[PDB]
Amino acid sequence: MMVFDDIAKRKIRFQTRRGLLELDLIFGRFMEKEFEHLSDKELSEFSEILEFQDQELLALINGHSETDKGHLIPMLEKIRRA
């Protein structure tokens, strides 16, 4: 229901990081670039995309996995961007 607090902050990260170095690097700037602009509301979506694993995420961008949510369609564009 559109939530976000000091927790979401650590959450965003606590969620990221996995068995993907490159993916671990991306987040570094990706977030600092996105998460920085990503407003509380937006941060809500990030969790939706982040929810996915590192592999899936990467593959996703590559066009491997799929997304059963149109709320990420946009987030992917922006996110995938950074």
Side-chain angles (χ1 to χ4, degrees):
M1 228 80 207
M2 236 197 261
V3 185
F4 150 80
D5 317 278
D6 157 48
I7 296 181
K9 232 71 78 70
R10 238 220 191 165
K11 216 210 202 281
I12 225 271
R13 250 174 122 175
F14 186 102
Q15 254 250 248
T16 50
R17 179 243 161 186
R18 218 130 212 169
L20 272 75
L21 178 71
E22 189 245 16
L23 205 41
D24 197 80
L25 324 192
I26 301 148
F27 290 129
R29 268 234 141 88
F30 158 27
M31 245 128 69
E32 225 291 304
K33 234 146 232 64
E34 263 285 67
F35 184 76
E36 179 123 292
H37 277 98
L38 300 172
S39 313
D40 309 356
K41 167 174 132 191
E42 278 280 290
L43 297 153
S44 198
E45 314 318 304
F46 213 162
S47 181
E48 297 220 291
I49 245 165
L50 293 167
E51 278 246 46
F52 255 116
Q53 327 223 29
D54 262 24
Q55 215 149 70
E56 301 248 336
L57 184 69
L58 219 67
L60 256 161
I61 283 179
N62 262 267
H64 238 293
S65 255
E66 268 243 30
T67 208
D68 214 328
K69 209 97 210 190
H71 240 336
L72 326 152
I73 271 204
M75 238 56 47
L76 256 181
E77 273 60 301
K78 62 195 73 176
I79 294 157
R80 190 249 261 190
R81 222 232 189 81

Coordinates of all heavy atoms in Angstrom, one line a residue:
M1 N 0.8 -1.2 0.0 CA 0.0 0.0 0.0 C 0.9 1.3 0.0 O 0.6 2.2 0.8 CB -0.9 0.0 1.2 CG -2.3 0.3 0.9 SD -3.1 -1.1 0.2 CE -4.4 -0.4 -0.8
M2 N 1.9 1.2 -0.9 CA 2.8 2.4 -1.0 C 3.4 2.7 0.4 O 2.9 3.6 1.1 CB 2.0 3.6 -1.5 CG 2.7 4.1 -2.8 SD 2.1 5.8 -3.1 CE 0.9 5.4 -4.3
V3 N 4.5 2.0 0.7 CA 5.1 2.2 2.0 C 6.6 2.5 1.7 O 7.1 2.2 0.7 CB 4.9 1.0 2.9 CG1 5.5 1.3 4.3 CG2 3.4 0.7 3.0
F4 N 7.3 3.1 2.7 CA 8.7 3.4 2.6 C 9.2 4.2 3.8 O 8.6 5.2 4.1 CB 8.9 4.3 1.4 CG 10.0 5.2 1.4 CD1 11.3 4.8 1.2 CD2 9.8 6.5 1.7 CE1 12.4 5.7 1.3 CE2 10.9 7.5 1.8 CZ 12.1 7.0 1.6
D5 N 10.2 3.7 4.5 CA 10.8 4.3 5.7 C 12.3 4.1 5.7 O 12.8 3.5 4.8 CB 10.2 3.7 6.9 CG 8.7 3.5 6.9 OD1 7.9 4.4 7.1 OD2 8.3 2.3 6.6
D6 N 12.9 4.6 6.8 CA 14.3 4.4 6.9 C 14.7 3.0 6.6 O 15.9 2.7 6.3 CB 14.8 4.8 8.3 CG 16.1 4.1 8.8 OD1 17.1 4.2 8.1 OD2 16.1 3.6 9.9
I7 N 13.8 2.1 6.8 CA 14.0 0.6 6.6 C 14.2 0.4 5.1 O 15.2 -0.2 4.7 CB 12.9 -0.2 7.3 CG1 12.9 0.0 8.8 CG2 13.0 -1.7 6.9 CD1 11.8 -0.9 9.4
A8 N 13.2 0.8 4.4 CA 13.2 0.6 2.9 C 14.6 1.0 2.4 O 15.0 0.4 1.4 CB 12.1 1.5 2.3
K9 N 15.2 1.9 3.1 CA 16.6 2.3 2.7 C 17.5 1.1 2.7 O 18.0 0.7 1.7 CB 17.0 3.5 3.6 CG 17.5 4.6 2.7 CD 16.4 5.3 2.0 CE 15.6 6.3 3.0 NZ 16.5 7.4 3.3
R10 N 17.6 0.5 3.9 CA 18.5 -0.6 4.0 C 17.9 -1.8 3.3 O 18.7 -2.7 2.8 CB 18.6 -1.0 5.5 CG 20.1 -1.0 6.0 CD 20.4 -2.2 6.9 NE 21.7 -2.0 7.5 CZ 22.1 -2.7 8.6 NH1 21.4 -3.6 9.2 NH2 23.4 -2.4 9.1
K11 N 16.6 -1.8 3.1 CA 15.9 -2.9 2.4 C 16.4 -2.9 1.0 O 16.9 -4.0 0.5 CB 14.4 -2.7 2.5 CG 13.7 -4.1 2.7 CD 12.3 -4.1 2.1 CE 11.4 -5.2 2.6 NZ 11.7 -6.5 2.0
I12 N 16.3 -1.8 0.3 CA 16.7 -1.7 -1.1 C 18.0 -2.4 -1.3 O 18.1 -3.2 -2.2 CB 16.8 -0.2 -1.5 CG1 16.1 0.0 -2.9 CG2 18.2 0.3 -1.4 CD1 17.2 -0.2 -4.0
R13 N 19.0 -2.2 -0.4 CA 20.3 -2.8 -0.4 C 20.2 -4.2 0.1 O 20.5 -5.2 -0.7 CB 21.3 -2.1 0.4 CG 22.3 -1.4 -0.5 CD 23.3 -0.5 0.3 NE 24.7 -0.9 0.1 CZ 25.7 -0.3 0.7 NH1 25.6 0.8 1.4 NH2 27.0 -0.8 0.4
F14 N 19.7 -4.4 1.3 CA 19.5 -5.7 1.9 C 19.0 -6.7 0.9 O 19.2 -7.9 1.0 CB 18.5 -5.5 3.1 CG 18.4 -6.8 3.9 CD1 19.0 -6.9 5.1 CD2 17.6 -7.8 3.5 CE1 18.9 -8.0 5.9 CE2 17.5 -9.0 4.3 CZ 18.1 -9.1 5.5
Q15 N 18.2 -6.2 -0.1 CA 17.6 -7.0 -1.1 C 18.6 -7.3 -2.2 O 18.7 -8.5 -2.6 CB 16.3 -6.3 -1.7 CG 15.1 -7.0 -1.2 CD 14.4 -7.8 -2.3 OE1 13.3 -7.4 -2.7 NE2 15.1 -8.8 -2.7
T16 N 19.3 -6.3 -2.6 CA 20.3 -6.4 -3.7 C 21.4 -7.4 -3.2 O 21.3 -8.0 -2.2 CB 20.8 -5.1 -4.1 OG1 21.1 -4.4 -2.8 CG2 19.7 -4.2 -4.7
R17 N 22.5 -7.3 -3.9 CA 23.7 -8.2 -3.6 C 23.3 -9.6 -3.7 O 22.3 -10.1 -3.1 CB 24.2 -7.8 -2.2 CG 25.4 -8.7 -1.8 CD 25.1 -9.6 -0.7 NE 26.0 -10.8 -0.6 CZ 25.9 -11.8 0.2 NH1 24.9 -11.9 1.1 NH2 26.8 -12.8 0.2
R18 N 24.1 -10.4 -4.4 CA 23.9 -11.8 -4.6 C 25.2 -12.5 -5.2 O 26.3 -12.0 -4.9 CB 22.7 -12.1 -5.5 CG 21.9 -13.3 -5.0 CD 20.4 -12.9 -4.9 NE 19.8 -13.7 -3.9 CZ 18.5 -13.5 -3.4 NH1 17.8 -12.5 -3.9 NH2 18.1 -14.2 -2.4
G19 N 24.9 -13.5 -5.9 CA 26.0 -14.3 -6.6 C 26.4 -13.7 -7.9 O 26.7 -14.4 -8.9
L20 N 26.3 -12.4 -8.0 CA 26.6 -11.7 -9.2 C 27.4 -10.4 -8.9 O 26.9 -9.4 -8.4 CB 25.3 -11.4 -10.0 CG 24.8 -12.5 -11.0 CD1 24.2 -13.6 -10.2 CD2 23.8 -11.9 -12.0
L21 N 28.7 -10.5 -9.3 CA 29.6 -9.4 -9.1 C 29.1 -8.2 -9.9 O 28.8 -7.1 -9.3 CB 31.0 -9.8 -9.4 CG 32.1 -8.7 -9.2 CD1 32.3 -8.4 -7.7 CD2 33.4 -9.1 -9.9
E22 N 29.1 -8.3 -11.2 CA 28.7 -7.3 -12.1 C 27.4 -6.6 -11.6 O 27.3 -5.4 -11.5 CB 28.6 -7.8 -13.5 CG 28.3 -6.6 -14.5 CD 26.9 -6.7 -15.1 OE1 26.1 -7.4 -14.6 OE2 26.8 -5.9 -16.1
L23 N 26.5 -7.5 -11.3 CA 25.2 -7.1 -10.8 C 25.4 -6.3 -9.4 O 24.6 -5.4 -9.1 CB 24.2 -8.2 -10.7 CG 22.7 -7.9 -10.7 CD1 22.4 -6.8 -11.8 CD2 21.9 -9.1 -11.0
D24 N 26.4 -6.7 -8.7 CA 26.7 -6.1 -7.4 C 27.3 -4.7 -7.7 O 27.0 -3.8 -6.9 CB 27.7 -6.9 -6.7 CG 27.8 -6.6 -5.2 OD1 27.0 -7.0 -4.4 OD2 28.8 -5.8 -4.8
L25 N 28.0 -4.6 -8.8 CA 28.6 -3.3 -9.2 C 27.5 -2.3 -9.7 O 27.4 -1.2 -9.2 CB 29.7 -3.5 -10.1 CG 30.6 -4.8 -9.9 CD1 31.8 -4.7 -10.8 CD2 30.9 -5.0 -8.5
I26 N 26.7 -2.9 -10.6 CA 25.6 -2.1 -11.2 C 24.9 -1.3 -10.0 O 24.9 -0.1 -10.0 CB 24.7 -3.0 -12.0 CG1 25.5 -3.6 -13.1 CG2 23.5 -2.2 -12.5 CD1 24.9 -5.0 -13.5
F27 N 24.3 -2.1 -9.1 CA 23.6 -1.5 -8.0 C 24.3 -0.3 -7.4 O 23.7 0.7 -7.1 CB 23.4 -2.6 -6.9 CG 22.5 -3.7 -7.3 CD1 22.9 -5.0 -7.2 CD2 21.3 -3.5 -7.8 CE1 22.1 -6.1 -7.6 CE2 20.4 -4.5 -8.1 CZ 20.8 -5.8 -8.0
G28 N 25.6 -0.5 -7.3 CA 26.5 0.6 -6.8 C 26.1 1.9 -7.3 O 25.7 2.8 -6.6
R29 N 26.2 2.1 -8.6 CA 25.9 3.3 -9.3 C 24.4 3.3 -9.6 O 23.7 4.3 -9.4 CB 26.6 3.5 -10.6 CG 27.9 4.2 -10.4 CD 28.1 5.4 -11.3 NE 28.6 6.6 -10.6 CZ 29.9 6.8 -10.5 NH1 30.8 6.0 -11.1 NH2 30.4 7.9 -9.8
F30 N 23.9 2.2 -10.2 CA 22.5 2.1 -10.6 C 21.6 2.8 -9.5 O 20.8 3.7 -9.8 CB 22.1 0.6 -10.6 CG 20.7 0.3 -10.5 CD1 19.7 1.3 -10.8 CD2 20.3 -0.9 -10.0 CE1 18.3 1.0 -10.7 CE2 18.9 -1.2 -9.8 CZ 17.9 -0.2 -10.2
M31 N 21.7 2.3 -8.3 CA 20.9 2.8 -7.2 C 21.3 4.3 -6.9 O 20.4 5.2 -7.0 CB 21.2 2.0 -5.9 CG 19.9 1.3 -5.5 SD 20.2 -0.5 -5.3 CE 21.2 -0.4 -3.8
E32 N 22.6 4.5 -6.6 CA 23.0 5.8 -6.3 C 22.5 6.8 -7.4 O 22.5 8.0 -7.1 CB 24.6 5.9 -6.3 CG 25.0 6.7 -5.0 CD 24.8 8.2 -5.2 OE1 25.3 8.7 -6.3 OE2 24.1 8.8 -4.4
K33 N 22.2 6.3 -8.6 CA 21.7 7.1 -9.7 C 20.2 7.1 -9.7 O 19.6 8.1 -9.8 CB 22.4 6.7 -11.0 CG 23.0 7.8 -11.7 CD 24.3 7.4 -12.5 CE 25.5 8.2 -12.1 NZ 25.8 8.1 -10.7
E34 N 19.7 5.9 -9.5 CA 18.2 5.7 -9.5 C 17.7 6.0 -8.1 O 17.0 6.9 -7.8 CB 17.8 4.4 -10.0 CG 17.4 4.4 -11.5 CD 16.0 5.0 -11.7 OE1 15.9 6.2 -11.4 OE2 15.1 4.2 -12.1
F35 N 18.0 5.0 -7.2 CA 17.6 5.1 -5.8 C 17.6 6.6 -5.3 O 16.8 7.0 -4.5 CB 18.5 4.2 -5.0 CG 18.1 4.2 -3.5 CD1 17.1 3.4 -3.1 CD2 18.8 4.9 -2.6 CE1 16.8 3.3 -1.7 CE2 18.5 4.8 -1.2 CZ 17.5 4.0 -0.8
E36 N 18.6 7.3 -5.8 CA 18.8 8.7 -5.5 C 17.6 9.5 -5.9 O 17.1 10.3 -5.1 CB 20.1 9.3 -6.1 CG 20.2 10.7 -5.7 CD 21.6 10.9 -4.9 OE1 21.7 10.5 -3.8 OE2 22.4 11.6 -5.6
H37 N 17.1 9.3 -7.1 CA 16.0 10.0 -7.7 C 14.7 9.3 -7.3 O 13.7 9.9 -6.9 CB 16.1 10.2 -9.2 CG 17.0 11.4 -9.6 ND1 18.3 11.3 -9.9 CD2 16.7 12.7 -9.6 CE1 18.8 12.5 -10.2 NE2 17.8 13.4 -10.0
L38 N 14.8 8.0 -7.4 CA 13.6 7.2 -7.0 C 13.0 7.7 -5.7 O 13.6 7.6 -4.7 CB 14.0 5.7 -7.0 CG 14.5 5.1 -8.3 CD1 15.1 3.7 -8.0 CD2 13.5 5.1 -9.4
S39 N 11.8 8.2 -5.9 CA 11.1 8.7 -4.7 C 10.5 7.6 -3.9 O 10.5 6.5 -4.3 CB 10.0 9.7 -5.1 OG 10.4 10.7 -6.1
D40 N 10.0 8.0 -2.7 CA 9.4 7.0 -1.8 C 8.5 6.0 -2.6 O 8.7 4.8 -2.6 CB 8.5 7.6 -0.7 CG 9.2 8.8 0.0 OD1 10.4 9.1 -0.2 OD2 8.5 9.4 0.9
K41 N 7.6 6.6 -3.3 CA 6.7 5.9 -4.2 C 7.4 5.0 -5.1 O 7.3 3.7 -5.1 CB 5.7 6.8 -4.9 CG 4.9 6.0 -6.0 CD 3.8 6.9 -6.6 CE 3.9 6.9 -8.1 NZ 3.0 7.9 -8.7
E42 N 8.3 5.6 -5.9 CA 9.1 4.8 -6.8 C 9.9 3.7 -6.1 O 10.0 2.6 -6.6 CB 10.1 5.8 -7.5 CG 9.5 6.5 -8.7 CD 9.4 5.6 -9.9 OE1 10.4 5.3 -10.5 OE2 8.2 5.2 -10.2
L43 N 10.4 4.0 -4.9 CA 11.2 3.1 -4.2 C 10.3 1.8 -4.0 O 10.8 0.7 -3.8 CB 11.6 3.7 -2.8 CG 12.6 4.8 -3.0 CD1 12.5 5.8 -1.8 CD2 14.0 4.3 -3.2
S44 N 9.0 2.0 -4.0 CA 8.0 0.9 -3.8 C 8.2 -0.1 -5.0 O 8.2 -1.3 -4.8 CB 6.6 1.4 -3.7 OG 5.7 0.5 -3.2
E45 N 8.3 0.5 -6.2 CA 8.5 -0.3 -7.4 C 9.8 -1.1 -7.3 O 9.9 -2.3 -7.6 CB 8.3 0.5 -8.6 CG 7.1 1.4 -8.5 CD 5.9 0.7 -7.9 OE1 5.5 -0.3 -8.4 OE2 5.4 1.3 -6.9
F46 N 10.9 -0.3 -7.0 CA 12.2 -0.9 -6.9 C 12.2 -2.2 -6.2 O 12.9 -3.2 -6.6 CB 13.1 0.1 -6.2 CG 14.5 0.2 -6.6 CD1 15.3 1.2 -6.3 CD2 15.0 -0.8 -7.4 CE1 16.7 1.3 -6.7 CE2 16.4 -0.8 -7.8 CZ 17.2 0.3 -7.5
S47 N 11.4 -2.3 -5.1 CA 11.3 -3.5 -4.3 C 10.7 -4.6 -5.1 O 11.0 -5.8 -4.9 CB 10.5 -3.2 -3.0 OG 10.4 -4.4 -2.2
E48 N 9.8 -4.2 -6.0 CA 9.2 -5.2 -6.9 C 10.2 -5.8 -7.8 O 10.2 -7.0 -8.0 CB 8.0 -4.5 -7.7 CG 6.9 -4.0 -6.7 CD 5.5 -4.3 -7.3 OE1 5.1 -3.7 -8.3 OE2 4.9 -5.2 -6.6
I49 N 11.0 -5.0 -8.4 CA 12.0 -5.5 -9.3 C 13.2 -6.1 -8.6 O 13.6 -7.2 -9.0 CB 12.5 -4.3 -10.2 CG1 12.2 -4.5 -11.7 CG2 14.0 -4.1 -10.1 CD1 12.3 -3.3 -12.5
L50 N 13.6 -5.5 -7.5 CA 14.6 -6.0 -6.6 C 14.2 -7.4 -6.1 O 15.0 -8.3 -6.0 CB 15.0 -5.1 -5.5 CG 15.6 -3.8 -6.0 CD1 15.6 -2.7 -4.8 CD2 17.0 -4.0 -6.5
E51 N 12.9 -7.6 -5.8 CA 12.4 -8.8 -5.3 C 13.0 -10.0 -6.1 O 13.3 -11.0 -5.5 CB 10.9 -8.8 -5.5 CG 10.2 -8.1 -4.3 CD 9.4 -9.1 -3.4 OE1 9.9 -10.2 -3.1 OE2 8.2 -8.7 -3.1
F52 N 13.2 -9.8 -7.4 CA 13.8 -10.8 -8.2 C 15.3 -11.0 -7.8 O 15.9 -10.1 -7.2 CB 13.8 -10.3 -9.6 CG 12.7 -11.0 -10.5 CD1 11.7 -10.3 -11.0 CD2 12.8 -12.4 -10.7 CE1 10.7 -11.0 -11.8 CE2 11.8 -13.0 -11.5 CZ 10.8 -12.3 -12.0
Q53 N 15.8 -12.2 -8.1 CA 17.2 -12.6 -7.8 C 18.1 -11.8 -8.7 O 17.7 -11.1 -9.6 CB 17.4 -14.1 -7.9 CG 16.1 -14.9 -7.5 CD 16.5 -16.1 -6.6 OE1 17.5 -16.1 -5.9 NE2 15.6 -17.1 -6.7
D54 N 19.4 -12.0 -8.5 CA 20.4 -11.3 -9.3 C 20.4 -11.9 -10.7 O 20.3 -11.2 -11.7 CB 21.8 -11.5 -8.6 CG 22.3 -10.4 -7.8 OD1 21.4 -9.6 -7.3 OD2 23.5 -10.2 -7.6
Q55 N 20.6 -13.2 -10.7 CA 20.6 -13.9 -12.0 C 19.4 -13.5 -12.9 O 19.6 -13.0 -14.0 CB 20.6 -15.4 -11.8 CG 21.5 -16.1 -12.9 CD 22.2 -17.4 -12.3 OE1 21.5 -18.4 -12.0 NE2 23.5 -17.3 -12.2
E56 N 18.2 -13.7 -12.3 CA 17.0 -13.4 -13.0 C 17.0 -12.0 -13.5 O 16.7 -11.7 -14.6 CB 15.8 -13.7 -12.1 CG 15.7 -15.1 -11.7 CD 14.5 -15.8 -12.3 OE1 13.5 -15.2 -12.7 OE2 14.6 -17.1 -12.4
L57 N 17.4 -11.1 -12.6 CA 17.5 -9.7 -12.9 C 18.4 -9.5 -14.1 O 17.9 -8.9 -15.1 CB 18.0 -8.9 -11.7 CG 18.0 -7.3 -11.8 CD1 16.6 -6.8 -11.9 CD2 18.9 -6.7 -10.7
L58 N 19.6 -9.9 -14.0 CA 20.5 -9.8 -15.1 C 19.9 -10.4 -16.4 O 19.7 -9.6 -17.4 CB 21.9 -10.4 -14.8 CG 23.1 -9.7 -15.3 CD1 23.3 -8.4 -14.6 CD2 24.4 -10.6 -15.1
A59 N 19.6 -11.6 -16.3 CA 19.0 -12.3 -17.5 C 17.8 -11.5 -18.0 O 17.6 -11.3 -19.2 CB 18.5 -13.7 -17.0
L60 N 17.0 -11.0 -17.0 CA 15.8 -10.2 -17.4 C 16.2 -9.1 -18.3 O 15.8 -9.1 -19.5 CB 15.1 -9.7 -16.1 CG 13.9 -10.4 -15.7 CD1 13.6 -10.1 -14.2 CD2 12.7 -10.0 -16.6
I61 N 17.1 -8.3 -17.9 CA 17.6 -7.2 -18.7 C 18.1 -7.7 -20.1 O 17.7 -7.2 -21.1 CB 18.7 -6.4 -18.0 CG1 18.1 -5.4 -16.9 CG2 19.6 -5.6 -18.9 CD1 19.2 -4.7 -16.1
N62 N 18.8 -8.8 -20.0 CA 19.4 -9.4 -21.2 C 18.2 -9.9 -22.1 O 18.3 -9.9 -23.3 CB 20.2 -10.6 -20.9 CG 21.7 -10.3 -20.9 OD1 22.4 -10.4 -21.9 ND2 22.1 -9.8 -19.7
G63 N 17.1 -10.2 -21.4 CA 15.9 -10.6 -22.1 C 15.6 -12.1 -21.9 O 15.0 -12.8 -22.7
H64 N 16.2 -12.6 -20.8 CA 16.0 -14.0 -20.4 C 14.7 -14.2 -19.7 O 13.7 -14.6 -20.3 CB 17.2 -14.5 -19.6 CG 18.0 -15.6 -20.2 ND1 17.4 -16.9 -20.4 CD2 19.2 -15.7 -20.8 CE1 18.3 -17.7 -21.0 NE2 19.4 -16.9 -21.2
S65 N 14.7 -13.9 -18.4 CA 13.5 -14.1 -17.6 C 12.4 -13.1 -18.0 O 12.7 -12.3 -18.9 CB 13.8 -13.9 -16.1 OG 13.8 -15.1 -15.4
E66 N 11.3 -13.2 -17.4 CA 10.1 -12.4 -17.8 C 9.6 -11.7 -16.5 O 10.0 -12.0 -15.4 CB 9.0 -13.2 -18.5 CG 9.2 -13.1 -20.0 CD 8.0 -12.4 -20.7 OE1 7.4 -11.5 -20.1 OE2 7.8 -12.7 -21.9
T67 N 8.7 -10.8 -16.7 CA 8.1 -10.0 -15.6 C 6.6 -10.2 -15.7 O 5.9 -9.8 -16.6 CB 8.6 -8.6 -15.7 OG1 8.5 -8.2 -14.3 CG2 7.6 -7.7 -16.4
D68 N 6.0 -10.7 -14.6 CA 4.6 -10.9 -14.5 C 4.0 -9.7 -13.8 O 3.0 -9.8 -13.0 CB 4.2 -12.1 -13.7 CG 3.0 -12.9 -14.1 OD1 2.0 -12.3 -14.6 OD2 3.0 -14.2 -13.9
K69 N 4.5 -8.5 -14.1 CA 4.0 -7.3 -13.5 C 4.3 -6.1 -14.5 O 5.5 -5.9 -14.9 CB 4.6 -7.1 -12.1 CG 3.7 -6.3 -11.2 CD 2.8 -7.2 -10.4 CE 1.4 -6.6 -10.1 NZ 0.7 -7.4 -9.0
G70 N 3.3 -5.4 -14.8 CA 3.4 -4.3 -15.7 C 3.9 -3.0 -14.9 O 4.2 -2.0 -15.5
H71 N 4.0 -3.1 -13.6 CA 4.4 -2.1 -12.8 C 5.9 -1.9 -12.8 O 6.5 -0.9 -12.4 CB 3.9 -2.2 -11.3 CG 3.0 -1.1 -10.9 ND1 3.0 0.2 -11.4 CD2 2.0 -1.1 -9.9 CE1 2.1 0.9 -10.8 NE2 1.5 0.2 -9.8
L72 N 6.5 -3.0 -13.4 CA 8.0 -3.0 -13.5 C 8.4 -2.6 -14.9 O 9.5 -2.2 -15.1 CB 8.6 -4.3 -13.0 CG 7.8 -5.0 -11.9 CD1 8.0 -6.6 -12.0 CD2 8.3 -4.5 -10.5
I73 N 7.4 -2.8 -15.8 CA 7.7 -2.4 -17.2 C 8.4 -1.1 -17.3 O 9.4 -0.9 -18.0 CB 6.4 -2.5 -18.0 CG1 6.1 -3.9 -18.5 CG2 6.3 -1.4 -19.1 CD1 5.2 -3.9 -19.8
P74 N 7.8 -0.1 -16.5 CA 8.4 1.3 -16.5 C 9.6 1.3 -15.7 O 10.6 1.9 -16.1 CB 7.2 2.1 -16.0 CG 6.3 1.2 -15.3 CD 6.6 -0.2 -15.7
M75 N 9.6 0.7 -14.5 CA 10.7 0.7 -13.6 C 11.9 0.0 -14.3 O 13.1 0.4 -14.1 CB 10.3 -0.1 -12.4 CG 10.5 0.7 -11.1 SD 9.5 2.2 -11.2 CE 8.0 1.5 -11.8
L76 N 11.6 -0.9 -15.2 CA 12.7 -1.6 -15.9 C 13.4 -0.6 -16.8 O 14.6 -0.6 -16.9 CB 12.2 -2.9 -16.6 CG 12.5 -4.2 -15.9 CD1 11.9 -5.4 -16.7 CD2 14.0 -4.4 -15.7
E77 N 12.6 0.1 -17.5 CA 13.1 1.1 -18.5 C 14.1 2.0 -17.8 O 15.2 2.2 -18.2 CB 12.0 1.9 -19.1 CG 11.4 1.2 -20.4 CD 10.9 -0.2 -20.0 OE1 11.6 -1.1 -19.5 OE2 9.6 -0.4 -20.3
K78 N 13.6 2.6 -16.7 CA 14.4 3.6 -15.9 C 15.6 2.8 -15.3 O 16.8 3.1 -15.6 CB 13.6 4.3 -14.9 CG 12.9 3.4 -13.9 CD 11.8 4.1 -13.2 CE 10.6 4.3 -14.0 NZ 9.5 4.9 -13.3
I79 N 15.2 1.8 -14.5 CA 16.2 1.0 -13.8 C 17.2 0.5 -14.9 O 18.4 0.8 -14.9 CB 15.6 -0.1 -13.0 CG1 14.8 0.5 -11.9 CG2 16.6 -1.2 -12.5 CD1 13.7 -0.5 -11.4
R80 N 16.7 -0.4 -15.7 CA 17.6 -1.0 -16.8 C 18.5 0.0 -17.4 O 19.6 -0.3 -17.7 CB 16.7 -1.6 -17.9 CG 17.6 -2.4 -18.9 CD 17.7 -1.8 -20.2 NE 16.7 -2.4 -21.2 CZ 16.7 -2.1 -22.5 NH1 17.6 -1.3 -23.0 NH2 15.8 -2.8 -23.2
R81 N 18.0 1.3 -17.4 CA 18.8 2.4 -18.0 C 20.1 2.5 -17.2 O 21.1 2.3 -17.8 CB 18.0 3.7 -17.9 CG 18.1 4.5 -19.2 CD 18.6 5.9 -18.9 NE 18.5 6.8 -20.1 CZ 17.4 7.3 -20.6 NH1 16.2 7.2 -19.9 NH2 17.5 8.1 -21.7
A82 N 20.0 2.9 -16.0 CA 21.1 3.1 -15.1 C 21.9 1.8 -15.1 O 23.2 1.8 -15.1 CB 20.7 3.5 -13.7

